[PDB]
Amino acid sequence: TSRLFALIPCAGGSALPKQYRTLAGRALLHYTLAAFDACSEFAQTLVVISPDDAHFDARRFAGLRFAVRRCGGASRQASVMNGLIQLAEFGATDADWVLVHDAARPGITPALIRTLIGALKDDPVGGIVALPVADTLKRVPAGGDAIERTESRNGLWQAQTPQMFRIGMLRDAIQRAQLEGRDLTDEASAIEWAGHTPRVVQGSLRNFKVTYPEDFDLAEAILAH
Numbered sequence: 001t002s003r004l005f006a007l008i009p010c011a012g013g014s015a016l017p018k019q020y021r022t023l024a025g026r027a028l029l030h031y032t033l034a035a036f037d038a039c040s041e042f043a044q045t046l047v048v049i050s051p052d053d054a055h056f057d058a059r060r061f062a063g064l065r066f067a068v069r070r071c072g073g074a075s076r077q078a079s080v081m082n083g084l085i086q087l088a089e090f091g092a093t094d095a096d097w098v099l100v101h102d103a104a105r106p107g108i109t110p111a112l113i114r115t116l117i118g119a120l121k122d123d124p125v126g127g128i129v130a131l132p133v134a135d136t137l138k139r140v141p142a143g144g145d146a147i148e149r150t151e152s153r154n155g156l157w158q159a160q161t162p163q164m165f166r167i168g169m170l171r172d173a174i175q176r177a178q179l180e181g182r183d184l185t186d187e188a189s190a191i192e193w194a195g196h197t198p199r200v201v202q203g204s205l206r207n208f209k210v211t212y213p214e215d216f217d218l219a220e221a222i223l224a225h
Contacts, residue, residue, distance in 0.1 A: 094168025
C-alpha cells in the first residue's frame with residue numbers, strides 16, 4: 001500500500017545552475033526526469049526549484065511526467081524537507097516512499113531505480129544506492145598535494161542517489177537536524193542521526209556525480225550512446 005514518489009531538489013553574477021547545463025543537446029535535469037518517467041509505478045515526480053529561479057523552462061522537459069514547485073529553501077536540506085511537505089498536495093502520506101535523487105547524476109537508469117525499490121520495499125527504514133570503495137585511500141592535508149599516509153578503506157562505501165526512505169520518517173529527521181543546527185550531507189545521514197539504520201544497495205559507476213568540465217565530457221560519452 002506504500003506508493004512511490006520521486007523528489008528532485010534544485011538550487012540556483014553567478015553562472016547557470018548545473019541542472020540546466022546542456023549535456024548532449026538536452027539539459028542535465030532531463031536525464032533524471034526521463035529515468036523516473038519510464039517508471040510508471042511512481043505516483044508522481046516532484047521537481048523542487050528556487051522561487052527566484054528564472055532559468056527553469058517546462059517546455060524543455062515536454063512529454064515527461066513530473067510536477068514543479070518553487071518551494072526551494074536556502075540549502076539542499078531545507079529544499080528536500082519543503083518538498084516532502086509539498087508532496088502531501090499530490091495525495092502523499094507519511095507512510096509512502098520517497099526517492100530523492102541528485103540531478104548531478106544523469107547516469108541514473110530505470111533499472112537501477114527498480115533494483116533499489118525491489119530490494120528495500122519491505123524494509124522498515126529503507127536505504128540508498130552505493131558503491132564499495134575500490135580505490136586505495138590517501139590522506140592529503142589541505143593546502144598541499146603531499147600524501148601524509150594511507151587510510152583504510154575497509155567497510156567504506158561511496159554513497160549515491162536515489163535515496164529511498166519513507167516521507168514521514170525523513171521529514172521528521174530533517175526537521176530535527178534543522179532545529180539542532182546540524183548541517184547534513186544527504187538524506188541518509190538525516191536518517192542516521194534520527195537513530196535509524198539505512199541500507200546500502202549496489203550502485204553503478206555510470207551513476208557518478210558530475211561537477212568538473214571533464215565529468216561532463218565523460219557523461220556526454222556514456223550518455224548519448
